[PDB]
Amino acid sequence: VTKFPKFSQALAQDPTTRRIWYGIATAHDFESHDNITEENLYQRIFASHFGHLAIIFLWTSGNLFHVAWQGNFEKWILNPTKIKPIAHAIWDPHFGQAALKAFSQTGVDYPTNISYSGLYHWWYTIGIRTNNDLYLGALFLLVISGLFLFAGWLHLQPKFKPSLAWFKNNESRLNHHLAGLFGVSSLAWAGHLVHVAIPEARGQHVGWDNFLSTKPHPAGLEPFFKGQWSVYADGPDSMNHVFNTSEGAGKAILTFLGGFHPQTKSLWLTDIAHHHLAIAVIFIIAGHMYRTNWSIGHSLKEILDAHRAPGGRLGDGHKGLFETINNSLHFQLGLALASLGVITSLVAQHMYAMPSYVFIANDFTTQAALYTHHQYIAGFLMVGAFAHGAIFFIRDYNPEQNKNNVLARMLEHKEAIISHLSWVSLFLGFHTLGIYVHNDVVVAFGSPEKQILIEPVFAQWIQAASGKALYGFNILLSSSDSVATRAGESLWLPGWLKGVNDTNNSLFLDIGPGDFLVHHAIALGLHTTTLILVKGALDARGSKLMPDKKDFGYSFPCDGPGRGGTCDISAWDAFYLAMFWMLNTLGWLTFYWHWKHLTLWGGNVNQFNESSTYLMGWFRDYLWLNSSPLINGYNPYGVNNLSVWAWMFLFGHLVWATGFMFLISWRGYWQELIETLAWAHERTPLANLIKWKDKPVALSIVQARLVGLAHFAVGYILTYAPFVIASTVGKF
Amino acid sequence: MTASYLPSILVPIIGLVFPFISMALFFIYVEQEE
């Protein structure tokens, strides 16, 4: 038998090309491997985690190294709003001379790619000033990578393999992750900011050479130990402070100013330092909750068992959940992915509105790239969370041990849940599409005054509550007389209200009927994607059509054409369908973000306000209008620096469309075709000297769905990325 | 020897040598009967 894959004899004995494909595709599903024990599983996962951390640190090392070596960081910091930051050098012998010239327009004498990752802005903010700073950073992270790699190896050695009990010590892990991983890391970062970033921002060099002798504040730690902490707030940077200079510089190391530094258009560094110090305290306190080796603290199991509402509406409450969660890595991974998915979206939303990095608000292409990047990542994480939730229900859920707890009662009313999600999706769909189409028809026939245009008054009211004066709602922070307004008036409110009421930033954009309709579109997307994923999870174990589905596993082709036909009945198929909806939803919201900003940055908000209420407006004024720079990256007259994006744009279209082949044409067609090819090979002279070792077969039913989805998704991203980048570069 | 020579040495190796050695090794691995 062909040895590969060694972890599955069933696959190893397969005489066809399917052996290789399925070998690759199941290599990381450790639970499914031959003769896996629970202890070996946890040990292998732990080592794999070390490997992953090393890869992250090598990637960061490479970014630092390439910028240090081939970048223009030292030149860029002298004029950050005018010079383009360099990602890395190009060496490509396929280039003709005209393309070499087109990519050599960034000050330096060799072809380069411009960076849109925002690394220069970040590194400058946090106190980096030279290529030697970057280089030593790169060296340091090489060493950290190696350390994690070594720890990975070490913890697979007999006398260093941790026990299963160590891996299920929930209370200790939570204490250390809260107080140490989060709390102390946050405290150390506040240290960096106070000792290095803030001095460097005021023109003072602080490095490893002089930091032991250079006090962050003239008063030292005397005020700290005397509880005279207000000393550290005295004398903030003036509104005329010129970043990276002493002109207008303050002495304060901790503040609560609110809003933005006028020059850099970013959050004050002294606010950021104080933020990190304050949350560090909270995290360190939070990490003393759970009982470890000294009797004080809580048991997680005891908390869960006790949380039953006495009126009985939650049944037995959270009884049994501790064991359910503690024995299921899929439950845990689903929780982790969901939570991280929410946080990644929050990062996208908060970083565009409240930027922390100097001059990044001016780098429009970077702002667009970063928003789109993080929202797409968040989308993937959310789908994965639900995928692992479904896998949990098949592989790890024990009905007996969860009887009448909150988890079991979800399954008890799954039809109520699914049918209501169906209703809300239909309700949003019919009416949102309906209004858009009303508007298109009435505008097309020359009567824009007949449009249905709903003011988003609830969102405008929430803006007013945070102090946006535009609407005249006179509520809370937008009223002078409010207790809310009075309470904060001597602290953050002056700085905050200035930023809110400034129209030349992204902090609470003006919103109108256009913003109303696309928010309901987004809501449609969230509900429908959720419908598909929830139906996936709650029907993973069985349905009327297939009552014994749990016996077939997460992923299987179907159950044949009987009982009416059962294509796409598995919980894996729900993941596959949800991916199309996730990509759609992310399309709508990123189109929205980008068009709203293109018109803001371009000084024509009216274009968005008028065009966005009917769908031809998006098609014409967004897609068609902004395509022009991109598709002229190369043409019969020559090439410019958008040539590469133009080519990638077409590559994306090609990959996407190739996906349709796998999604539309299904397996049996191809297997018959491959038979005739096997026939021809064996009957062709000379050629039939050569013999396959693996019998060629068409891809499996599930494999086709996966390969089709992969092409569809890769094509989606490789189309949109060049557009979003070249559109903005082309305009500004 | 200087550093500006490095792309012209390395890119051909990472692009035309490393992958084909890797492909060859993987091919031998997956066809072994053992």
């Binding site: 292998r44 080592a47 794999s48 070390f50 490997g51 090393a54 090598l58 190294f65 240090a68 070596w69 030292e74 030279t130 290529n131 030697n132 280089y135 790169a138 060296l139 090489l142 060493v143 990578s145 190696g146 790699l149 070594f150 990975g152 190896w153 697979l156 050695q157 | 020897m1 200087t2 550093a3 490095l6």
Partner: peptide, 28 residues
């Protein structure tokens, strides 16, 4: 700015994760 010497030091140091990666890979 960054010298040939500095680039060679980086390349030499990058052998440490390379070798260790090989070891981890094999052990997994």
């Amino acid at each position: 700015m960054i010298n040939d010497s500095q680039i060679f030091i980086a390349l030499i140091l990058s052998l440490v994760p390379a070798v260790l990666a090989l070891k981890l890979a094999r052990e997994l």
